[PDB]
Amino acid sequence: KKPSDYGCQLHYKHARVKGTLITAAELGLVDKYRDLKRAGQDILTCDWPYHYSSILYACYGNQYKILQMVEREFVGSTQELTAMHTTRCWVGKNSAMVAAYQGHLETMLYIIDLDMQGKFTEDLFKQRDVMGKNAMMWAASQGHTDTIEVLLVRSLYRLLPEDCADPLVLKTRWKLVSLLADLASHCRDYDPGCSRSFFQEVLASIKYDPVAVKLKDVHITVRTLQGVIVSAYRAGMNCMGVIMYCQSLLQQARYFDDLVAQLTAWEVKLLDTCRNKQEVQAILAPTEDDPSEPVGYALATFDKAFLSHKFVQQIFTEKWDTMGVTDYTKSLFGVVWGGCSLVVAFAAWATICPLVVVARSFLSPVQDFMMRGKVIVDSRFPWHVPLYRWLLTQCALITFTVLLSYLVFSFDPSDPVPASVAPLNTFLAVWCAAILVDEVQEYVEEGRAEYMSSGWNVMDVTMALSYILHYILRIIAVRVTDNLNILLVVNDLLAAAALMAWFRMVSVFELSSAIGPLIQMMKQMLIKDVTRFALLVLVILLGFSVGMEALFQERVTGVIFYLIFAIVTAILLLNLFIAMLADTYTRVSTQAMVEFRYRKAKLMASYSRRDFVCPPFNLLHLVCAAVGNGLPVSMRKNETVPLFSWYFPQGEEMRQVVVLQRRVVDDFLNSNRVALFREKLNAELPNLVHEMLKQK
């Protein structure tokens, strides 16, 4: 007996062969935990260096059997249990975070089991910790794919309503809860001899009596997601929302990219099931029954396959432009006449806009006249054309780049004391206060993540700092009334505001495809391939700069043979940098018409809510919006008006939209039922070709 050619190549090489309810629950003795409690102890005993309670240890070491034994006589009201499961940790966890911190299927099925009972008064899996994670963000960060699927079935179970009574919505709720009871299927209670499998009362209150295990029987495949999308639509839901919500779960799970890219191509498949504009705005409509906007959701989860569709791009176009003004550029007559009216209307804007700011906020019927608009977008009322709000915030942006470049071009230290308080320098400082007040009220109005995602919201603040801290260091450090010091930083920060000024001017090509998808390309290989390559160069460059000093501390064959190592390594690095931008070019030039249309639809919606004013007037209107209440809208007209006009329809137009979406969605759900029927036949051909070659 000698091992084979396969045996001694592959086979395994080496020849193998207290108390205090703290270590009582961590080890798993059930009888020891009860006896120490009956004498007298604390069930929330806190250890110092990590705040771990006694309950929370049993969730940690997978001994759920303590947590069932706690249920027998040691909890009273159902509020007391939530005080004992959601106590805290030192990093911020609760019982369902520590049991999903590491993969503990036998315990995370228990905390899920108590939640479907309603034994907790809190949404125990929706809480957050101090890091910011979730009960499901922890199971996906570590990668515990066995308890992700237990979390995903619960989140797919809370979606379907309890109140509805329908055979297609009650079949795929008992189908989900059986997929967890079969997933436990063992691990009985602490007390032996009890009819309690792991899930009895949740299978009981479901109203469904039915009348060799494969891999598609114990997992969430495409067949059970189609069984949820059609069955959330039966209970009455936005089918464009349940697709957008189920995809936001599976993107969080991080280990299902077979179901994310199937659900992503189910929302593009649904969108072009419509024919016209009347059918697109039907299925995207938040009517009064299910007030759920999936347009407003998709530009909050950045849904690029949705937001760049050729139908969603035309329900935004009919609002922000609807006059073809963006295509008075590719012609000979449109540029010389449409551009001529641009400089006229901008001059008409700057000499009328502070006049209509103060008249809007005071008691006059011209605030009724400024509301006379915004239901039809045309040149009869140009102030509510969202393109004509974009053209004036760019024409005010170009002015700030000229007027600050005009400042450095006419500048010398020979000016007198009346130069710090100047008719030019002081006007460019109230601009930078109007910028910083705008970036504050674009931070709290939208949110932290919807503000720090554009890439220019840094450069709005930065040139509004390096000019505020230049005008301040002109009156604090320069000769007006103060002493003398080193003043190079005062003249250094001016170009720190002037470099970012003309770099800010490239935002005027945020429209214009073929000039557009280069600026994203320029700002993609600068935030991820410049700060990343210059760190690895820096730790290498410290090797040569210190290695240079060791040579000359105590000859040509010492240094020229040292230099050829440096010219090679600089070429061998520049070889790697050029192949790191030509890589990033190829990653963003293929999506050049999806990354552009998404970035276009995020400013056809940002400028469609906001007002026609304040690139400089956030210190001219905000000072009169508080006064108009003191003697009435500041930023509340973005949120009251619901982004469109084919939203919440009263009367008998809702009687047509719900009729219309039942001919779009029901003419979609019998198309996924046909494409998936071929996949049932796709993996069956060696049983169908064998029959047709037997019948023959």
Binding site: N670, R673, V674, L676, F677
Partner: peptide, 15 residues
């Protein structure tokens, strides 16, 4: 041979 006609079977009969 039927310059724009082609034999068709049927895509239906799903679930």
């Amino acid at each position: 041979g039927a310059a724009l006609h082609e034999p068709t079977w049927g895509v239906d009969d799903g679930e």
